[PDB]
Short mmCIF file of N, CA, C and O in Angstrom, two decimals:
data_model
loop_
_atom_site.label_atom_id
_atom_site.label_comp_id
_atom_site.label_asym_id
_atom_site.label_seq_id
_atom_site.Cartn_x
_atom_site.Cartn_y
_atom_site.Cartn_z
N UNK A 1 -106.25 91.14 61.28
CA UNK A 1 -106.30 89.70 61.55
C UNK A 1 -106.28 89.38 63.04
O UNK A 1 -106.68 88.32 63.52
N UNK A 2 -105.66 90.65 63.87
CA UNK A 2 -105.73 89.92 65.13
C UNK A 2 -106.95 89.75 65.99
O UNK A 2 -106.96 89.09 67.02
N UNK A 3 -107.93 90.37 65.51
CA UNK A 3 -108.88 90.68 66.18
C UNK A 3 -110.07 89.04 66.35
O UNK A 3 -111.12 89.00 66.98
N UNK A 4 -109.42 87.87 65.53
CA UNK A 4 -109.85 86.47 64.90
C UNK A 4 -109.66 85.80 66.44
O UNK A 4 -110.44 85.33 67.26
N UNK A 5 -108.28 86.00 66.40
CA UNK A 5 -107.49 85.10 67.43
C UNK A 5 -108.34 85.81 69.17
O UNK A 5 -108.72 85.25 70.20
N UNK A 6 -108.32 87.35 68.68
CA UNK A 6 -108.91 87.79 70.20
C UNK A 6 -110.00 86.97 70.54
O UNK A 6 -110.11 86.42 71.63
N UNK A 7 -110.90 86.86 69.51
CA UNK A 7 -112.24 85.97 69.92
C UNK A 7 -111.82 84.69 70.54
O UNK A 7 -112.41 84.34 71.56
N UNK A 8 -111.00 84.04 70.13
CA UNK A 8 -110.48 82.72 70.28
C UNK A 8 -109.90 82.98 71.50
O UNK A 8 -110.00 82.03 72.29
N UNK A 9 -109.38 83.87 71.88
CA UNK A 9 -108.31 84.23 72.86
C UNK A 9 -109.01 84.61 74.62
O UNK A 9 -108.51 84.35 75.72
N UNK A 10 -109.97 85.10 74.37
CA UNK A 10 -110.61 86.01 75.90
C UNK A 10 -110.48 87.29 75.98
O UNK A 10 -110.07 87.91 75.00
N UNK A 11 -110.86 88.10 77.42
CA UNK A 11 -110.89 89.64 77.49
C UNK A 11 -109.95 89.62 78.79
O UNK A 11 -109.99 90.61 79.52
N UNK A 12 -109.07 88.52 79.13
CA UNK A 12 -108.73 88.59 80.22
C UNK A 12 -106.91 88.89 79.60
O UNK A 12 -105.98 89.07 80.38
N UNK A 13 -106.78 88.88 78.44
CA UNK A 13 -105.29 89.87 77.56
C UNK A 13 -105.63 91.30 76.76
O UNK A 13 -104.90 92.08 76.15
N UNK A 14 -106.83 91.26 76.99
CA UNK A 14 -107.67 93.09 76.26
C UNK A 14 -106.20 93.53 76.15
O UNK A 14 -105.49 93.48 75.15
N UNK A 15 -105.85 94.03 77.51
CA UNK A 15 -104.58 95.12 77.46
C UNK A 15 -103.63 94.82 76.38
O UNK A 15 -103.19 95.66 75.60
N UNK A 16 -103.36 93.60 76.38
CA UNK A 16 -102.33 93.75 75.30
C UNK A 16 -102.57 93.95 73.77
O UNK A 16 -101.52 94.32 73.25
N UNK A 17 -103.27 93.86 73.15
CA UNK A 17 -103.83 94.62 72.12
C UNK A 17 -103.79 96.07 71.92
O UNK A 17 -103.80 96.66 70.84
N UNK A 18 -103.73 96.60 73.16
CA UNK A 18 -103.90 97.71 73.56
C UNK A 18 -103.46 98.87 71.95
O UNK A 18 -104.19 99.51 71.19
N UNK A 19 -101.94 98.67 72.02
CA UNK A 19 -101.24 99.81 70.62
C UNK A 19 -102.06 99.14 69.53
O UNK A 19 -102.75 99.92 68.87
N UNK A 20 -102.13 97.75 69.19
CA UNK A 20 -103.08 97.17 67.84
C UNK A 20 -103.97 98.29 67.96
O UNK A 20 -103.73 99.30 67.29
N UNK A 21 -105.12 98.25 68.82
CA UNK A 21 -106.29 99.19 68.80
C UNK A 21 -105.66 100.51 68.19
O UNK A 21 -105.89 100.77 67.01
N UNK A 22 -104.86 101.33 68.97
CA UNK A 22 -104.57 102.62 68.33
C UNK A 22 -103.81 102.49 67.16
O UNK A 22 -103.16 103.45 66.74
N UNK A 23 -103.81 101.15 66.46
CA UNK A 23 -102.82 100.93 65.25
C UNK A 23 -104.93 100.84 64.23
O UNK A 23 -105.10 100.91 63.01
N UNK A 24 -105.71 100.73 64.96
CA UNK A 24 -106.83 101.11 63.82
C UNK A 24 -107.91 101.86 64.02
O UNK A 24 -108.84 101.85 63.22
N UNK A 25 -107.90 102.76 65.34
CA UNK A 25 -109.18 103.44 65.53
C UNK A 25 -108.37 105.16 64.63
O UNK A 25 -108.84 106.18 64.11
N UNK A 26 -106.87 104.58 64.92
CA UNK A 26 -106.19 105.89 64.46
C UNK A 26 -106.15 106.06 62.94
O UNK A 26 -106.04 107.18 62.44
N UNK A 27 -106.23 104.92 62.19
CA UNK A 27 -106.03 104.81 60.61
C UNK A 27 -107.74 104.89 60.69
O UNK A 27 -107.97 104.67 59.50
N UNK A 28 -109.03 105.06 61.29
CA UNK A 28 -110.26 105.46 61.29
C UNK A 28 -110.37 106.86 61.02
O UNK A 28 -111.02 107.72 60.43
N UNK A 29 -109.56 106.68 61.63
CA UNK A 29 -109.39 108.73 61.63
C UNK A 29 -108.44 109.39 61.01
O UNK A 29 -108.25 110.59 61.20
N UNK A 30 -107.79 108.72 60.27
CA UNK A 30 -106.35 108.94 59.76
C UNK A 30 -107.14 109.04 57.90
O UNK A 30 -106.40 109.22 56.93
N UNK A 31 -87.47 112.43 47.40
CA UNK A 31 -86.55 112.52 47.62
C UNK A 31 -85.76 111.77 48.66
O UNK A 31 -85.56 112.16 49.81
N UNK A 32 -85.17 110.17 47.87
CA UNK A 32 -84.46 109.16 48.48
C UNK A 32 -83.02 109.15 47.96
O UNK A 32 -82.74 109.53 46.83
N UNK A 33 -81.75 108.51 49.19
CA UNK A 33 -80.64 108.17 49.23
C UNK A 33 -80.30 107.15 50.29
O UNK A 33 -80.78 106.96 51.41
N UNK A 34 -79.22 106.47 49.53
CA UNK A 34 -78.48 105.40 50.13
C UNK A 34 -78.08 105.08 51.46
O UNK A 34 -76.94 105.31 51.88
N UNK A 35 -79.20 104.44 52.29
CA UNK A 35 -78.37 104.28 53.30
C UNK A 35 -77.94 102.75 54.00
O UNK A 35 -78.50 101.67 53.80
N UNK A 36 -76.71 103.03 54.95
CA UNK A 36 -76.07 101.69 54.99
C UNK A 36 -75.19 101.25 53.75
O UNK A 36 -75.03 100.07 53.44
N UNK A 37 -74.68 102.19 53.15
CA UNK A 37 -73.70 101.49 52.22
C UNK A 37 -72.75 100.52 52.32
O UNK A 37 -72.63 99.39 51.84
N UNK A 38 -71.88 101.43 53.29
CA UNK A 38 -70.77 100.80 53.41
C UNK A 38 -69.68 101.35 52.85
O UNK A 38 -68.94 100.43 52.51
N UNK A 39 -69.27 102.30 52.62
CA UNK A 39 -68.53 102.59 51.69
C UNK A 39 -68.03 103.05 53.27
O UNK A 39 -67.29 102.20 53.76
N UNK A 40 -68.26 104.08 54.05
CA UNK A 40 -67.63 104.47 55.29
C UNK A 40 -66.45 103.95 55.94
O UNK A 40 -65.58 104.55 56.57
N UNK A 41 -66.60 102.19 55.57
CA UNK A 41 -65.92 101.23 56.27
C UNK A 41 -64.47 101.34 55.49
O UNK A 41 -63.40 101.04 56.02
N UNK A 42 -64.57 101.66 54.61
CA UNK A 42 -63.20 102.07 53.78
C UNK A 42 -62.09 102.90 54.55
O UNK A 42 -62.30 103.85 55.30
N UNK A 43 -60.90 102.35 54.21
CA UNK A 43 -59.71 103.11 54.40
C UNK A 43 -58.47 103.78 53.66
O UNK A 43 -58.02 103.18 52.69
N UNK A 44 -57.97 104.83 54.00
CA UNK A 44 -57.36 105.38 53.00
C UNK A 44 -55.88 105.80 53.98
O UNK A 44 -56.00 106.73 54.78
N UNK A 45 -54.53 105.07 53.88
CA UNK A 45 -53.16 105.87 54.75
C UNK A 45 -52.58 106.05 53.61
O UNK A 45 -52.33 105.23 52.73
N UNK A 46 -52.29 107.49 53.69
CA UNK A 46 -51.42 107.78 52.72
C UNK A 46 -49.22 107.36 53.25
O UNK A 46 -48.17 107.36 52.61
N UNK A 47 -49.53 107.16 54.32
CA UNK A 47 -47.92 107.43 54.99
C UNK A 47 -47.44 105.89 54.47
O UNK A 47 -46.24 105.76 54.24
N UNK A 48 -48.43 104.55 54.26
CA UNK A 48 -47.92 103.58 53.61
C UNK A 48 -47.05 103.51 52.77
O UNK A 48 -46.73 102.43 52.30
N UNK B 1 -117.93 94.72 123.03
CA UNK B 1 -116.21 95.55 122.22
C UNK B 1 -115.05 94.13 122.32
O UNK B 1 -113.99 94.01 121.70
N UNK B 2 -115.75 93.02 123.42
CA UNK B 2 -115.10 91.49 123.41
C UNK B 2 -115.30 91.05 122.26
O UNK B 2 -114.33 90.41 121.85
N UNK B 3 -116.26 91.12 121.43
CA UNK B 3 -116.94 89.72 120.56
C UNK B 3 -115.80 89.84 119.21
O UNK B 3 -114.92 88.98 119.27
N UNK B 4 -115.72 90.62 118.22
CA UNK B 4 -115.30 90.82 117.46
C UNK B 4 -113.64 90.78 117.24
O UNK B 4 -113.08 90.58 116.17
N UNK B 5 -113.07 90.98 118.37
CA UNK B 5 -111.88 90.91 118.75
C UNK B 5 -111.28 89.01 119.60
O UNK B 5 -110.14 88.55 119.59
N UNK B 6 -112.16 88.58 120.02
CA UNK B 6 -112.01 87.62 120.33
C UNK B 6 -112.09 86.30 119.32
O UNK B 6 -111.44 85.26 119.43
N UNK B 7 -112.95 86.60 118.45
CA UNK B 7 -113.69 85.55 117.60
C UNK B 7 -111.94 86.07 116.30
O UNK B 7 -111.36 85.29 115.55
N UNK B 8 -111.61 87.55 116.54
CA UNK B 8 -109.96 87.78 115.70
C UNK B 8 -109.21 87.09 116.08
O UNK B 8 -108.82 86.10 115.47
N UNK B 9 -108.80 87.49 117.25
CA UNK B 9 -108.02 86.64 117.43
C UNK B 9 -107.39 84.79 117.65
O UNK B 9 -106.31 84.22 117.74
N UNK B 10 -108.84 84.41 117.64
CA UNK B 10 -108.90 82.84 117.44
C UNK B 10 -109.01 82.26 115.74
O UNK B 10 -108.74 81.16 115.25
N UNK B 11 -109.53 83.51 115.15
CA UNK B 11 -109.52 83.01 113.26
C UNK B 11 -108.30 83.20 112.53
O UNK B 11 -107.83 82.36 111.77
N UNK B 12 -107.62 84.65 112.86
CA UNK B 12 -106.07 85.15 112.34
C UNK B 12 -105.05 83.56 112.10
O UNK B 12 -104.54 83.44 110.99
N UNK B 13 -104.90 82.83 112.77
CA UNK B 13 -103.21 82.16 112.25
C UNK B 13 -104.02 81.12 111.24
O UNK B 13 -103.54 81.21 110.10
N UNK B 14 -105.18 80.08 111.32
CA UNK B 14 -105.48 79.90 110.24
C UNK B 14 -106.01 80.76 109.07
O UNK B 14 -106.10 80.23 107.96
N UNK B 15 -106.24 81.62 109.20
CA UNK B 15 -106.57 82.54 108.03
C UNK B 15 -105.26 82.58 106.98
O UNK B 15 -105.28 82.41 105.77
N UNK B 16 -104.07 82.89 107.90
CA UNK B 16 -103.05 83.23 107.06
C UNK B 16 -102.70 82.21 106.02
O UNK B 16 -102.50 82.41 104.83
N UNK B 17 -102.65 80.86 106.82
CA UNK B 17 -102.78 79.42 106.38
C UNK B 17 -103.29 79.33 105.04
O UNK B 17 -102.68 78.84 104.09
N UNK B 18 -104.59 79.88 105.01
CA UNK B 18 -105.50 79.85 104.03
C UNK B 18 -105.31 80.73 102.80
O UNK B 18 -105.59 80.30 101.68
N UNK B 19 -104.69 82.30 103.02
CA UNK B 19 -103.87 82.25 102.40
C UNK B 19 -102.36 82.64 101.89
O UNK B 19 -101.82 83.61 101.35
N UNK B 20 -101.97 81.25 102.39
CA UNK B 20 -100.49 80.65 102.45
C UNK B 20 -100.39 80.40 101.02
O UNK B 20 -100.16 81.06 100.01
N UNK B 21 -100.76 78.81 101.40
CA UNK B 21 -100.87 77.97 100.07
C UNK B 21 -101.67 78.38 98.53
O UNK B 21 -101.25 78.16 97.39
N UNK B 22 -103.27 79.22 99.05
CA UNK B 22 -103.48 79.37 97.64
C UNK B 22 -102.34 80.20 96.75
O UNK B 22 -101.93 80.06 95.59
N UNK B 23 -101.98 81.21 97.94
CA UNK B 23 -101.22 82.42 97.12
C UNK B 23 -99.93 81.65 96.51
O UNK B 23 -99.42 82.14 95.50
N UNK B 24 -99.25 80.18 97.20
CA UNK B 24 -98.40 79.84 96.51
C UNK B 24 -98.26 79.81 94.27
O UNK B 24 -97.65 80.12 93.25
N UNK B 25 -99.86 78.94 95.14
CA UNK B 25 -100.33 78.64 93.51
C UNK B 25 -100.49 79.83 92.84
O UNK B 25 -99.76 79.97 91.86
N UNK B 26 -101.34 80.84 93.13
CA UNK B 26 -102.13 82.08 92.65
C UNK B 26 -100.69 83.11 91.73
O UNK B 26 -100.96 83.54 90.61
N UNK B 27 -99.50 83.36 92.25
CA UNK B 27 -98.44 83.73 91.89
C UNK B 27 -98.10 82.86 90.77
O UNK B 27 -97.92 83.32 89.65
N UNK B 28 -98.00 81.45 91.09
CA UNK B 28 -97.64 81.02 89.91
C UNK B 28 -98.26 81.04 88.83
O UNK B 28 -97.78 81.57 87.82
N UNK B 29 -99.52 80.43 88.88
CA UNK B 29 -100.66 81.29 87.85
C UNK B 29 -100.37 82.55 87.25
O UNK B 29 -100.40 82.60 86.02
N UNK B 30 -100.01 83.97 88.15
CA UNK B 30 -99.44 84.48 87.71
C UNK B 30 -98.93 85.15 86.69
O UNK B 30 -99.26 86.05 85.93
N UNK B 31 -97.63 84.17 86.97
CA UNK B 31 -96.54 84.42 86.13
C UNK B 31 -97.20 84.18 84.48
O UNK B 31 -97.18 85.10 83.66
N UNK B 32 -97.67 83.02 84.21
CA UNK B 32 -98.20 82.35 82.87
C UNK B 32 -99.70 83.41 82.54
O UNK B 32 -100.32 83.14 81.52
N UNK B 33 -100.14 84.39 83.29
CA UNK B 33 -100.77 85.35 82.63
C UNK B 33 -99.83 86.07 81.48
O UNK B 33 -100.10 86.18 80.28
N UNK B 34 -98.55 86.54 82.21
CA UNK B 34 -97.43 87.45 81.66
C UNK B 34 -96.97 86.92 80.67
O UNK B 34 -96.73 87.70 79.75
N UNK B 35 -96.63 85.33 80.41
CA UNK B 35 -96.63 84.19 79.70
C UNK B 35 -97.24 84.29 78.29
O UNK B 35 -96.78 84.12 77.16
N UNK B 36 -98.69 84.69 78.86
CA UNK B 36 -99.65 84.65 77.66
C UNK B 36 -100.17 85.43 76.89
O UNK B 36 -101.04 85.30 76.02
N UNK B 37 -99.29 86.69 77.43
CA UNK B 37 -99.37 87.78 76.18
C UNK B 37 -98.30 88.94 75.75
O UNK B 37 -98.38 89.73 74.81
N UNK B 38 -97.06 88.77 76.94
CA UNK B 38 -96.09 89.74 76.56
C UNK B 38 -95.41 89.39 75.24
O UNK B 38 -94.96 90.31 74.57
N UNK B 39 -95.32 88.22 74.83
CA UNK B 39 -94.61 88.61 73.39
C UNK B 39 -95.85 89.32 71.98
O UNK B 39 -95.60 89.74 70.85
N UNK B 40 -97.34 89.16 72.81
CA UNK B 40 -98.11 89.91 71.61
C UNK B 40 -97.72 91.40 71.97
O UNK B 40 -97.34 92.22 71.14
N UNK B 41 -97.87 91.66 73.42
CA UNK B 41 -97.68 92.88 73.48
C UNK B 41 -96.53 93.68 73.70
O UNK B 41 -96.55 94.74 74.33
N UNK B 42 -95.40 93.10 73.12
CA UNK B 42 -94.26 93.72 72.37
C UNK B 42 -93.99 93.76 71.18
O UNK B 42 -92.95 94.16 70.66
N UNK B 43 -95.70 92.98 70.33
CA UNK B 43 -94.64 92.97 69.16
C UNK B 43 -94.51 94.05 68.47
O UNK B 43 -93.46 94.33 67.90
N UNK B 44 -95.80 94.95 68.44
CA UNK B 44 -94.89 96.55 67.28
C UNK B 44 -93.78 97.27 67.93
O UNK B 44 -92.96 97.90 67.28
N UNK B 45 -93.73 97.13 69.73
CA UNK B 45 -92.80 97.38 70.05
C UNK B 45 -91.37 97.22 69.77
O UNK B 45 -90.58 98.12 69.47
N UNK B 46 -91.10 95.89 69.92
CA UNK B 46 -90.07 95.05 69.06
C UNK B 46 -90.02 94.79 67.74
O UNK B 46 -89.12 94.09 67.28
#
């Protein structure tokens, strides 16, 4: 989609597109667990 | 070896003059290049 707005946009921000481009000339050429539980945050004193 | 050096030294302090002021503007301009595309070109970055 960005390539809409470039037209609209000029060649005088090319550069910044720059990674976009290698985000499609490169796709041209181109066992899960829990994380962030929370459980970590837990505490356990036994001397209470 | 007069001509070129003479005709310098009488153009140099308005020259600078000249540009003084555009470059005031020209910087500010500038800035609103940087304006007009660093948040595209951070965004997969960010």
């Amino acid at each position: 989609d960005f390539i809409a707005e470039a037209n609209a946009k000029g060649w005088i921000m090319a550069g910044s597109y720059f990674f976009d481009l290698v985000k499609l000339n490169g796709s041209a050429t181109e066992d899960q667990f829990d994380t962030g539980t929370g459980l970590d945050k837990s505490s356990f004193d036994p001397t209470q | 070896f007069a001509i070129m050096i003479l005709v310098n030294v009488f153009l140099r302090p308005s020259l600078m003059i000249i540009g003084y002021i555009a470059a005031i503007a020209l910087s500010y301009v500038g800035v609103w290049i940087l304006n007009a595309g660093f948040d595209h070109a951070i965004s997969y970055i960010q």
